[model samples]
Target: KVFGRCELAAAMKRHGLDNYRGYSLGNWVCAAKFESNFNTQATNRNTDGSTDYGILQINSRWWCNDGRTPGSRNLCNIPCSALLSSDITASVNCAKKIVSDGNGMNAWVAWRNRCKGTDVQAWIRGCRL
Candidate 1:
């Protein structure tokens, strides 16, 4: 019943990320709670007419180029098609990297504060799939 679709399971398996389902689900829930509140079809219009799409709120015009390749402009090729193709573990890892490389998990922590209004540790525990 993950993602409410058999295709998503198959996609996770195909991406070799199925082994970490708990982590994946946790990360997905956390990301969605922060990004778009688990709305899969979410879209945001940018000033340039490029659209941010999907549950993770991926931006297509800024992050989609060459159709298949990962875009250079955004992290994890921030577009639904490419981002969905990525394993949740990978996505979380990348996000963690981004957070660690800078001033801690500030972005994630801020998002959690705004969305869940709980301490970061509690948020992490709650999001544990």
Candidate 2:
């Protein structure tokens, strides 16, 4: 499922992503925009044979086990398939873990390049939350 800007903002906020690890709702929303264009089923395979999954594009290398990433840490302890669901609860939980980890929001390169050091406040504009 694809989400509108405000729609994704509310969803992430409902999942407690607002101000998570000192990042605002816009940061999360902005990251999701650039990473997957708000598409829940987004997936990308890296040249190194790793894959990114879901709206947040959580990776198969260190976060989730795809049973094909070779040395996956599965730090989130959920199947990579869980991230692709439109429900988003599991994806949100796993994203929280990724942010809570030492890397914080920078764990997502798209967030760093597209969301960080920029005015992403508009990403959540008009959202009730």
Candidate 3:
């Protein structure tokens, strides 16, 4: 339900995701591309029964609660569904806290798998932001 890559990048920038904790917009977009394909409603069920929610694919074990489950740090103080909405506010807020935990986007396995060492300048290439 989103536009092109630049549109996604521009939206992310508006969300104040230009550059955070040394992570570039390129990598963030790269992560989003792989994690959720830019679908804000994206959700994945893990083998361990945990689920990944939202564009950034934040997990249930720590960031939010999976209503059916009970053991979670829930440090973000919101339900996991909040991250599943098209809106990125809660997702971004939890992300800020996740990065502050010291891993930054490295906390994202998708980012590590696809974006960690790639030259991602082309991701932001031609974007106005």
Candidate 4:
């Protein structure tokens, strides 16, 4: 079975991330486990009752404030079907631009190191065909 865009987005957010390019499904799953334990609709509340929702635990009020439409959401909001329609690398790249800042790939690289204990670039390097 293939993963959905929302599924991938949730995975990205759980790791305090926005982009997904150059990341493998295994890496994404690893990050998901490290973050929200793979709960897609996972939510948390502070002592004050403010809530965070979704697999990545995005605060619906804060992140989804613009609306649940594709472009309205913080990220590209690519549909799960669209995300799953392509190879993992292509799907991840599609979402990467939506989340990337001007910082280039540094944030993603650092995240891989801190969260996965491996260089994402190196992993991608190993994946090159």
Backbone collisions counted per model:
0, 0, 0, 3
Candidate 1 TM-score, C-alpha based: 0.42
Location of the lowest summed lDDT over 10 successive residues in candidate 4: 120-129
Window of ten residues with lowest summed lDDT in model 1? 120-129
Model number with the top lDDT = 2
The stretch of ten residues in a row with the least summed lDDT in candidate 2 is 120-129
Clashing pairs in 4: 5-80, 14-56, 40-55
TM-scores for every predicted model = 0.42, 0.95, 0.91, 0.38
Candidate no. 3 TM-score: 0.91
Candidates in order have lDDT scores of 0.44, 0.91, 0.83, 0.41
Per-residue lDDT for 1-129 in model 3, tens only? 443689878887887777877777898889888999987788898877788988888999888987855577788999999997867778888887898797777799988888888997779899898
The lDDT, on a scale of 0 to 1, for candidate 2 is 0.91
Off by over 4 Å in 2: none
lDDT of 2 by residue, 1-48 (tens): 998888888888888888988899999999999999999999999999
Q: In lDDT terms, how accurate is model 4?
A: 0.41
